[PDB]
Amino acid sequence: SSQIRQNYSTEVEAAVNRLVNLYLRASYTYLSLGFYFDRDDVALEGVCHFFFELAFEKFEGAFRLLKMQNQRGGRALFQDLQKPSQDEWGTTLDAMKAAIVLEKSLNQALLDLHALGSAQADPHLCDFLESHFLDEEVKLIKKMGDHLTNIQRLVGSQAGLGEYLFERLTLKHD
Amino acid sequence: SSQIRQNYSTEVEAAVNRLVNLYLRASYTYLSLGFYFDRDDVALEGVCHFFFELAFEKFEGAFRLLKMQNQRGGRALFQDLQKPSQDEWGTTLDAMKAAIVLEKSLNQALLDLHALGSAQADPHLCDFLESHFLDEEVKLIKKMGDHLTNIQRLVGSQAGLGEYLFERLTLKHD
Amino acid sequence: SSQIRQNYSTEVEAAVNRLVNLYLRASYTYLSLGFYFDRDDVALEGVCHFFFELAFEKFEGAFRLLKMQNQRGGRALFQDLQKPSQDEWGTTLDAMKAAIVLEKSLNQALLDLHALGSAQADPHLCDFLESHFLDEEVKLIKKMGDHLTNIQRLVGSQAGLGEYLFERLTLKHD
Amino acid sequence: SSQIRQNYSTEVEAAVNRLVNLYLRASYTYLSLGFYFDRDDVALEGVCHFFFELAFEKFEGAFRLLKMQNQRGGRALFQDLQKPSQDEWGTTLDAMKAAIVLEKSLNQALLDLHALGSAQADPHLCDFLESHFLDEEVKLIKKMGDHLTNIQRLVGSQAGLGEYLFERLTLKHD
Amino acid sequence: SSQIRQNYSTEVEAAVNRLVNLYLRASYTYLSLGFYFDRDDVALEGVCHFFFELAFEKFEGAFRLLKMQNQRGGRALFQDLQKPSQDEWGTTLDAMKAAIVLEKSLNQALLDLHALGSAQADPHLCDFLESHFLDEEVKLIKKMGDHLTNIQRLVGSQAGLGEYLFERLTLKHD
Amino acid sequence: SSQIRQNYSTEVEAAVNRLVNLYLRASYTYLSLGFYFDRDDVALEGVCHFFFELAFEKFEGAFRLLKMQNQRGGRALFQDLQKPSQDEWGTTLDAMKAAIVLEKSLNQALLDLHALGSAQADPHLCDFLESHFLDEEVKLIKKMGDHLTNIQRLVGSQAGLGEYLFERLTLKHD
Ligand SMILES: [Cl-]
Ligand SMILES: [Cl-]
Ligand SMILES: [Cl-]
Ligand SMILES: [Cl-]
Ligand SMILES: [Cl-]
Ligand SMILES: [Cl-]
């Protein structure tokens, strides 16, 4: 079959294709989050830009997985992409809670693939995830946790005021 | 009569002169809004500057219509300009609600003139409006809608605080 | 009432609002003059540009009066703006004669307001007019008088030739 | 037949080829006008340069139509090009009157093609004409009308003097 | 309901959401085409880069439609995204034939939406498509047709040689 | 009659007008060749650009002849321009064979005019042709002969391959 494939299990090849679908799903979810915060009746520019940056970051992760699939001699297989879980995303707090749930699901999928690679004695796969995915995910989840705490402290008795101030003074706008 | 006029109906010529009056009326309304927010007992610099920019934008639209009237060989005719609807404009929220009502009236006048041009098979007129007016109006109304939503979220129990913060952190001052 | 108003009579406040209307009327008159000289059957670019510059200058005078009204703690009040006295403005000579009549009417209104300020012992008002209006008006009327004399000397037996040459060789075009 | 053609009627394809012939005819007419004003017994450099620029502008319009024909998958077909209507073009006034007649004939051909495209529900064709032809034609006809008025005012009793002055002081020489 | 929506039908709003799904489907198809040509057993870098550029171009079209949806006050609604029609894309000729079929399907969807906008007297929608989509699509389909002709002429008796040469000497690499 | 004409025969004047028609015919032929190679079903960019450059070169020759006609005091007379000999131009080899036939016809017309000028003892005419036409024509015909030989050597058993390679590796594109 493949002229280059070496030490690359069918189990890892399949799991990489599944992980691509999870990252593209996440990218699509962040595209929906971004456009919700762009609505004229939501209108939180910094929140919109935060989620569009994450849509691009998740697409880049999918792209890197697909490049690696070909580098190892596996076959990229694309499946249908389910639409995001919601059409409307509530407050910035609701959205950032949904985002951290989504990132922890990606992080668990990364850890599960690392464990499969470990079991299959596939050190290139394990290094690839460690070098391009695990720390990026830990750093993003820490950032989201920091944002959740600041959003929560700003709710008070004046939720609209707090949501405005967080978008203006923490998030980047423009 | 005219050495240059071609495919330019008397109906469109008249409607263009009426639209100039509507844009000059709008410009005058925004000059009044700007000077109200400059009062020492109102004193919202970013709101003042927002409305002065719109006074200049509406004057530029009138100027472009008048230039086009002459380019087509119609006769610019000026009528009396009514004063604005109010002498005092209330809160930033009141003013931005009046502004969006005014812009939707200009937008409907643009759409009505486009429909007349369509009926008269006047593609230069229809292109002129599409290229210099329709999208500028859609973008401005979207901006005003974004501002209305942010102003509304800041009212809370503390209207003065919200009105200050919106002027400081969204509007341009510096 | 006003937290800042000091030595600012109701008579001056009202007269300033009237003077704003006169300057905006003058600006509108110069916008009409400019577009008449832009017609394809008139086509005197330097004359068109001369009058558009004066439309902007008169608007700036209105703007400065309105800023001063607020600086003194008076209330800017806008009234309807009458359309210009003519729809068609004849020759460059006819137009420049109408312009000098209009400027002498503005100059008399300035002198009348200065005399009211003098009577009311309002030195800020009298200084404001002296510093931003009286000499600008004297200089403009002198310029118009210079232009009238040159236009008149060029009529001769060959009015079209003279009107072309004045526009080409005295007025600014591109 | 064509691998790219989509929504492109045979009626529009044929009309585009006819319009190319009209623009090339116009270009040839302006080449003849330019060389007439270059004669040592006519010798009006600014008039010569005005018409050579229009010869190049009309050729560019033909070129853009031909490029569009291929972009849509139609077949460019060239026909014989008739010589211009005159061998000698009289005065600058005669020439500019012939030019405005020629431009209004091109403008009507543009409007007729736009109406055909409209009837055929061909929005690419209608946009192409609006974006590259209709406003360029309106602006050129306005310019020619401005020039006709200035040429006419300079005839007076001294036609040679006026024709010299217009060439020297309005037209570009280098 | 919407504070900004004006002249924006539910029919157009729905059709825009469907068109977004078609553009995202097309983007996903081009991502699959790109990674197929990146395989070590296909290895045509210029073909890979051609299709990745188109994946980004189709995503940008989806993004612009979604921005416009919000500008008009409609609600962006995302649906499931079907996977591409093939897992393996054959030769460069097979792939470029599939690409032109896909682009003509997008072009027909654009023309159908333009016709709906026309019927609904929605000139902003019709201008938006003309200005950002119709000519981009005509130009891309012309490019693909040019490439199909060059690929076809290179097949000869030596298909591998021709496929190499086209990738090396026409497409951008590295 | 002419104030400048000296040593300029009616025979040369007429022959110059005929030669202008031949150069404009040649320019039109090259415009048709260029647009044929721009077709999506021909698609040879370097061949398209080669022939468009020659269309411009032939127009420049016509322009120089017309300038010279006026410099000598002859009268430029334009005649109808026949359409090119073909609507479709076959292969690059067919087109380059037609081009060399066309250039040798122009070269013979140049040599015939030089011989007339010689017979009429018109050294300015003979120098003009030698300095701006004869060597340009010899150099172009040599270039076309070089191209014909390279095109012919590339036909082999694989005409499509050869036609691609010649366009890619000899002609200017991208
Ligand atoms: Cl789902
Ligand atoms: Cl009123
Ligand atoms: Cl009145
Ligand atoms: Cl004829
Ligand atoms: Cl499917
Ligand atoms: Cl023929």
From Swiss-Prot, chains A, B, C, D, E, F:
GO terms for cellular component: autolysosome; autophagosome; cytoplasm; cytoplasmic vesicle; ferritin complex. It is found in: Cytoplasmic vesicle, Autophagosome; Cytoplasm; Autolysosome. The keyword Acetylation applies. InterPro entries: Ferritin, Ferritin-like, Ferritin-like_diiron, Ferritin-like_SF, Ferritin_CS, Ferritin_DPS_dom. Fe cation binds at E53, F56, E57, E60, F63. One of its GO terms (molecular function) is iron ion binding. Residues 53-60 are annotated as: Catalytic site for iron oxidation. It comes from the Eukaryota. Keywords: Acetylation, Cytoplasm, Cytoplasmic vesicle, Iron, Iron storage, Lysosome, Metal-binding. The keyword Acetylation applies. GO terms for biological process: intracellular iron ion homeostasis; iron ion transport. Its main location: cytoplasm. It holds the Pfam family Ferritin. In horse spleen the light chain is the major chain. Oligomer of 24 subunits. There are two types of subunits: L (light) chain and H (heavy) chain. The major chain can be light or heavy, depending on the species and tissue type. The functional molecule forms a roughly spherical shell with a diameter of 12 nm and contains a central cavity into which the insoluble mineral iron core is deposited. Interacts with NCOA4. PANTHER family: FERRITIN (PTHR11431), FERRITIN LIGHT CHAIN (PTHR11431:SF47). This is Ferritin light chain. It comes from Equus caballus.
